[PDB]
Design a protein around this ligand. Sequence first.
Ligand SMILES: C[C@@H]1C(=O)N(C)CCN1CCOc1ccc(C2CCN(c3ccc4nnc(Cl)n4n3)CC2)cc1
Length: 127
Amino acid sequence: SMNPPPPETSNPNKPKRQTNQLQYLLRVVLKTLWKHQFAWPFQQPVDAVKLNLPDYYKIIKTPMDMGTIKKRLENNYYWNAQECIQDFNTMFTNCYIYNKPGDDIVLMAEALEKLFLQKINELPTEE
Ligand SMILES: C[C@@H]1C(=O)N(C)CCN1CCOc1ccc(C2CCN(c3ccc4nnc(Cl)n4n3)CC2)cc1
């Protein structure tokens, strides 16, 4: 089977704005998670062809990864911080859905998620 197209990261028809929350989501949240020791399987869309995961896209219908989230923040694709937070949550839950409790990839996702939740609990109030 083929991989689906990646999630859209840019759209010239969507309106754009700059907020302190979206700035914090790129500057603090994504930059911190990106450097984490267990971030590398989550830095690009799951390549089910190269990774030999033929049922991945039969089970995961809403794929999401940090490479996509970063490109969306860098392209001013998100209007609300909540859209970015939901993408981080979709990424984690996809991993828990496809994999099983105790799998190393799940342990890796759980560690990035705990860090994510710490940095999101310190999200600055909207200026
Ligand atoms: C479906 C799934 C997914 O959810 N995502 C998002 C992308 C990935 N993908 C497929 C699964 O990928 C994985 C990517 C990385 C790993 C880790 C597991 C832990 N570790 C080890 C462990 C023991 C060991 N002994 N000697 C070496 Cl060396 N090691 N290294 C490094 C590689 C596991 C699965």
